[PDB]
Amino acid sequence: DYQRL
Amino acid sequence: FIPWRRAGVKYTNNEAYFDVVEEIDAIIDKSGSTVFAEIQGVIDACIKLSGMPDLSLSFMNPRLLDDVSFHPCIRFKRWESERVLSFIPPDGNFRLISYRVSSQNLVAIPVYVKHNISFSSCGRFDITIGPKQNMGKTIEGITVTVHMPKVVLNMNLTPTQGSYTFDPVTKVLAWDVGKITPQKLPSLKGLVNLQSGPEENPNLNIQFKIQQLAISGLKVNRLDMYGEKYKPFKGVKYITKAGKFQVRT
Numbered sequence: 192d193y194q195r196l
Numbered sequence: 197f198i199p200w201r202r203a204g205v206k207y208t209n210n211e212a213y214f215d216v217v218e219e220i221d222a223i224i225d226k227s228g229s230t231v232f233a234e235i236q237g238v239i240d241a242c243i244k245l246s247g248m249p250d251l252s253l254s255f256m257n258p259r260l261l262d263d264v265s266f267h268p269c270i271r272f273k274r275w276e277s278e279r280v281l282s283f284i285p286p287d288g289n290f291r292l293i294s295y296r297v298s299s300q301n302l303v304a305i306p307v308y309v310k311h312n313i314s315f316s317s318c319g320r321f322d323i324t325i326g327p328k329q330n331m332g333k334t335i336e337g338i339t340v341t342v343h344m345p346k347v348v349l350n351m352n353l354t355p356t357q358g359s360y361t362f363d364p365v366t367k368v369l370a371w372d373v374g375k376i377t378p379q380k381l382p383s384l385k386g387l388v389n390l391q392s393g394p395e396e397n398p399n400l401n402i403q404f405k406i407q408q409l410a411i412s413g414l415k416v417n418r419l420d421m422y423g424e425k426y427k428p429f430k431g432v433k434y435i436t437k438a439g440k441f442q443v444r445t
Contacts, residue, residue, distance in 0.1 A: 193213060193431025196419040 200286040210428035219439035233303035239292040243285040250423040256415040263296040297412040306330035309443040315394040322385035337405040338373035353386035397445035410434040
């Protein structure tokens with residue numbers, strides 16, 4: 192769901 | 197001397213999340229041209245990080261951000277000089293910045309409405325909604341609300357999906373659409389009863405939400421953490437929703 196940084 | 201953060205909070209898993217949430221206001225004319233559009237946004241943060249981390253959030257295209265309001269944790273000078281948001285965050289949930297998107301580019305318009313409306317004691321109301329500049333992302337939570345003029349008494353429409361109501365005292369038509377799917381566009385069509393004895397067609401007010409899209413194009417570059425040596429999970433999500441979005445007919 193979140194784009195990983 | 198970090199007023200917004202106490203030392204020694206410990207989480208079992210160190211995580212930092214940011215949510216870039218943009219609201220699009222637009223007025224679209226009956227030919228499909230943008231009369232007005234603007235985008236306002238916020239970056240919300242959910243920070244569950246042990247100790248005293250010091251974060252630097254940067255963007256691919258920081259020139260999009262105009263009229264920014266900053267959380268007090270932000271070091272304004274490093275934004276002014278490097279376009280990096282550098283801050284030791286409060287704990288938990290807080291709004292990092294709010295912004296308006298720069299006028300340098302036109303606003304992308306992620307939905308379109310095809311309309312055939314003609315208003316005799318009998319009119320025709322036919323509308324179909326579809327994706328426009330949405331980057332192929334799913335358009336969900338769609339509702340269409342129409343303040344019908346006094347002459348409209350009641351209506352008999354057929355939705356291809358969702359449900360509608362019409363209030364014959366307030367004259368509001370509200371169509372709960374749901375989400376747009378590829379194979380079959382949502383449409384609402386039928387006849388309208390008029391009080392026999394109409395200048396402009398009514399405006400269509402549309403609500404919607406689109407995950408995995410910041411309609412401004414805003415994109416994060418990196419999030420770096422200093423001052424602690426653990427490796428936290430770090431993520432960003434983007435969502436666009438309608439603010440006041442109107443199609444004229």
